[PDB]
Amino acid sequence: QTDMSRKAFVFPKESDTSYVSLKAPLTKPLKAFTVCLHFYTELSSTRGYSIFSYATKRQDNEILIFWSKDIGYSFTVGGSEILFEVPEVTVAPVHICTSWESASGIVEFWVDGKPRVRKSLKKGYTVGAEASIILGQEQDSFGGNFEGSQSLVGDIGNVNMWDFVLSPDEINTIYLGGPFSPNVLNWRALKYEVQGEVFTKPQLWP
Amino acid sequence: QTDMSRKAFVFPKESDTSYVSLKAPLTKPLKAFTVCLHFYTELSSTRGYSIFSYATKRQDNEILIFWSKDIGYSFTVGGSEILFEVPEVTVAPVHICTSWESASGIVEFWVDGKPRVRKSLKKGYTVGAEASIILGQEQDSFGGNFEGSQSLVGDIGNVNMWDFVLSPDEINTIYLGGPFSPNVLNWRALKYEVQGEVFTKPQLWP
Amino acid sequence: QTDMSRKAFVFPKESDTSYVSLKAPLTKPLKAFTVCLHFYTELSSTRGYSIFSYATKRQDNEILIFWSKDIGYSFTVGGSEILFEVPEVTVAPVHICTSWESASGIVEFWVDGKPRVRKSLKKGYTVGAEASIILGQEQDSFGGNFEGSQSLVGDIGNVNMWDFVLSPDEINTIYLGGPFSPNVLNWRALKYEVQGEVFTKPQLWP
């Protein structure tokens, strides 16, 4: 396990072959989860890109967080999709947290510590545990078929994932960088592999 | 009685079928009242919705607080209506307090602790105490005929009601969340019934 | 004499019938004056209205403070007018102080403690002491002939008048609500009569 504190992955050129694969130790299906991350990119006015793609053998978009051009954030579970439209965007590092709960279908989406309205999505589903998690690309089969036009360019980091819904109070401590203990992906104890032009560099966000 | 402190009702999907009904202990007709609540919704740009609906067997819109598409807040007593127009809306949680006084007809409306101008409505009227209070829906009979196009989607909470007009100094401490004690409807001692898809979740507003 | 501190007059409906008349112990003619007041209205986009009207039996507009639609504040003395144009208006409570001096014709106008540029009006004139001061309406004759289309709707208060020009440092004290002593017309010792629908209510402004 590597402590990636103060470090970020950099995807400095558009590619369909550069990516990093994050390994989860998870062995029980997710009835709920939270994932939080920092990313920075200038693509937001140019094109859509995949922020965080989670796939399973049955389903290539089992969880996906995606920016869609002129729409805003797209969040999808089990291939069903909802939109958190953004009316205007500025170039700066952005923190997001998203969480979902099978027992209720409630999605929370948080941007820079400000909550979006809760929306229903894909109630009663279960997310598979046998998963391929990739940053930098959108994956259209388990671990592959990346499209260069959906790749991320820029930086991503502080990727943390929990198998439960963080409360609003906890999410505030994540945004402020307080102490917390992830249990699916932990940025302070990450297990990962890198392919192609990807670099680990000091983070640009404070 | 349930203490709903730090908790909110979530109406995560559009329907006419799901609502919450609040029970008042009141047994004397209201010569005056105050209502305060937090709500959060993205509908404000798409369509109108009912924020708080109070009906009596004679009159479905005995008190109604409503958002009118591209108009702003609509406040109506006894079926007579006035508008507090809003020229542009931010998407964030919003606190409102409203109050009315039969002896003068003066309405006050407060948005995020800022007072709107005082207006006149239904001087000399009285509001019935045999009442059905419903959240999430607009009702057109004593307890039903809900219109799905008027339902709320999003969150509501801190719904408090007083049988008297709060002063400007008190309303400020309501907004800042100081000590106070309602007497018609108390969020710390709520009586309610939930129908359909409604969830109680931690509040998103601070 | 009534201490109106923390209280305001409320004019909740458009009418020509409702007004309040303020009495001054004047005997010496006014070689100069200052008048300060708080008011709050939504009319500023809809139509003009009379903020403060001082009439004498020779002259209905002996002092007038008026809002002119799409123009801004109009200030008139002895029936002659100067405009303090406002390029864009916002709906909030607003404090104004205005002062005039016969020996120079210098008019000062202050809005929320921001001074407007000094202007010249009616140098060498004198304002009559045998005066009718009315709030809520525009006098077109001594004490009467009100025009409903010129009535104020909303709130007015902290009306204070001095028979001398307050210095900039004093006026800042008035705006911040420090200690001061009016000598023509004092809100802490007001003499008035109410006619029609006018109410005294707690002030909305701080």
Added chain:
Amino acid sequence: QTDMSRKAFVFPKESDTSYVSLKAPLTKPLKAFTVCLHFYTELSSTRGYSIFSYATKRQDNEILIFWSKDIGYSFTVGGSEILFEVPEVTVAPVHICTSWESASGIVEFWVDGKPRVRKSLKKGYTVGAEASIILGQEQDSFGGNFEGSQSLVGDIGNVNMWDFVLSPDEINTIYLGGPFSPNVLNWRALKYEVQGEVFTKPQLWP
């Protein structure tokens, strides 16, 4: 010599006839200077006006600071002109400092303590000491030929002039009103003559 501290000249009517003349004790020609002043006027959207006109027997615009409509500040030395364009202007009191140096032609212009970029003007020139300094008017002969369409309306004060270039760290203390001592023209010790409608009043700026 009069201490004008916290006083200002008021030019409340447009005219060609009213002005004040300031006398300098200077007896050696200026190889460099600084002049700082406060002024306040609403003309900025209506027309140009002379802020500070310095003339010598040979040259009526030996130093001139002039607002030019929809352009911004014009600064001229020896009849040669440069512009410091202002793209949008606001109604508030404004402090300017300007300074020039013969040995380099460097002009510095400062507005509310913010420096404009340094520019070159009339390197090697020499400003005459036999000077008529006039506030309120632009002058086209030594001490006369004023044009009413170039008069200032509003207020001017804190006019201070030095026969050397103030450093950036000094200019900041002029703007903040720290201790300083001019030597060509000193507001603490002014010699002046007033003609026509001009008044000395408490200053509007803090």
Added chain:
Amino acid sequence: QTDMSRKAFVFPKESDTSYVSLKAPLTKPLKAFTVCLHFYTELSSTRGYSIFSYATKRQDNEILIFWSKDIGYSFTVGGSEILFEVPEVTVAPVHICTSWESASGIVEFWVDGKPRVRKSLKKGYTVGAEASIILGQEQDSFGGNFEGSQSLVGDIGNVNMWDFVLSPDEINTIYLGGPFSPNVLNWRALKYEVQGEVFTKPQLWP
């Protein structure tokens, strides 16, 4: 060496002929570098200009930092170019740090302490040490062929250069003016030659 602390170069006229040449003691080629500088100019709306030009006898634009009209900052290494577009520009002093690393091609560009997204440029290249560094102009041959249409007008200073990539934490202390030690080019220990109309004056930025 000259300590240029709190001092800046002023280029007050457009010309082909005024420039300063800075001497680097470097004697090993650069696999990476950082350069930071302050500049101030009004040209940004009018035309492009060269902020910092590094040339070698093989290559006129070996490092170049350039502003291109209505595009934004251009940064080039080895004659290959990337853009950090600026959608709107403001007239104030601006501090930029830029850095590059051959081992990765990562470019970092920082404007007023805010990072732009990292980009890829000239991976595996090697910047020559036999170099001519010029301020005020762009050179198109080693030490010459300046074009007046590309000259800088205004101010430049605090030009510091390092033969390594500064971390994000170090770059913040550069921007805040903490203690630091450049090793290719040091503003506190500068060697330079001045040609034509260039002046050394106190800096306008704080």
